[PDB]
Structure formats: C-alpha cells, structure tokens
C-alpha cells in the first residue's frame, strides 16, 4: 500500500499514473476532496475534511 | 470578423489527439490548460466505438 499527502492536481495525477503503471494500491490523503473523473480503482483519495 | 466586440479577441489553438490514454492527460494539461482557453471541443475518435 502507498500513502501520500498530495497538495496539488499535478501531484494527484502523478500519483495516479504511478499507481496505474506499477499495478499497486496507492492511497493519498488530501485536505479537501479534489474532483477527479478517473475510473482507476488502484488510486484512492482520502478527504480529511469532509463536506459540511 | 462578424462580431462587433472590440475587447474580445479570438484565438484558435489546435491540439491533436494522442493515441494513448496514459499520455492524453499530460498532453491536455500541458497545452490546453496552459493556454487559458475558454471551453474545449470533444471529437469522436477515429475508431467507430471507443
């Protein structure tokens, strides 16, 4: 499993690409839920602060 | 040319479709977003169903 704390869209895209290429589970925790239309199930985004 | 707007300038940018989904996102982000363009047209792929 991969743990990350991305802060920008580019970091999230790089993490998703790395997870897809390496075929491994990757989870990144962000302060806010960044919208993403990617259908890749190997990349997970964790919203530390959920919607009010 | 047919519009009477003076403060609005029309610029045309052409971006070919990369034949790979892995590199499609990078090409789209490097060119389309970097140009600060308004709206993006989606075109059908050459394949009948993709």
Residue A18 at interface with chain B, using a CB cutoff of 8 Å: no
Method: cryo-EM
Which H or E run contains B25?
A: helix B21-28
Task: Tell the burial category of A4 from Cβ atoms under 10 Å away from its Cβ (0-12, 13-18, 19+).
Answer: buried
Tell me the C-alpha to C-alpha distance, in Å, between residue B42 and each of A27, B15, B16, B28, B39: 31, 11, 11, 12, 10
List Cβ neighbours of B38 (8 Å cut-off, separation of 6 or more). none
> Resolution in angstroms, to 1 decimal, for this deposition?
4.1
Compute the nearest-CA separation of B14 from chain A (Å). Answer: 23
Q: How many CB pairs under 8 A join A and B?
A: 7
Cβ of B22 within 8 Å of Cβ of A13? The answer is no
Residue B31, token pair as written in the block:
């060119």
In the block, tokens 């962000």 appear at A30
Give the residue ranges of DSSP H helices in A1-52: 9-22
A2 contacts A24 by C-beta, under 8 angstroms:
yes
């Amino acid at each position: 499993a991969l743990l990350a704390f991305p802060q920008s869209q580019g970091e999230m895209m790089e993490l998703d690409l790395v997870s897809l290429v390496l075929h491994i589970p990757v989870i990144s925790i962000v302060r806010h839920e960044f919208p993403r239309e990617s259908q890749n199930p190997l990349h997970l985004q964790l919203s530390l602060e959920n919607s009010l | 040319k047919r519009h009477g707007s003076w403060k609005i300038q029309l610029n045309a940018t052409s971006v070919t479709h990369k034949p790979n989904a892995i590199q499609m996102a990078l090409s789209v982000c490097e060119d389309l977003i970097s140009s600060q363009v308004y709206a993006i047209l989606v075109s059908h792929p050459p394949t009948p169903n993709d």
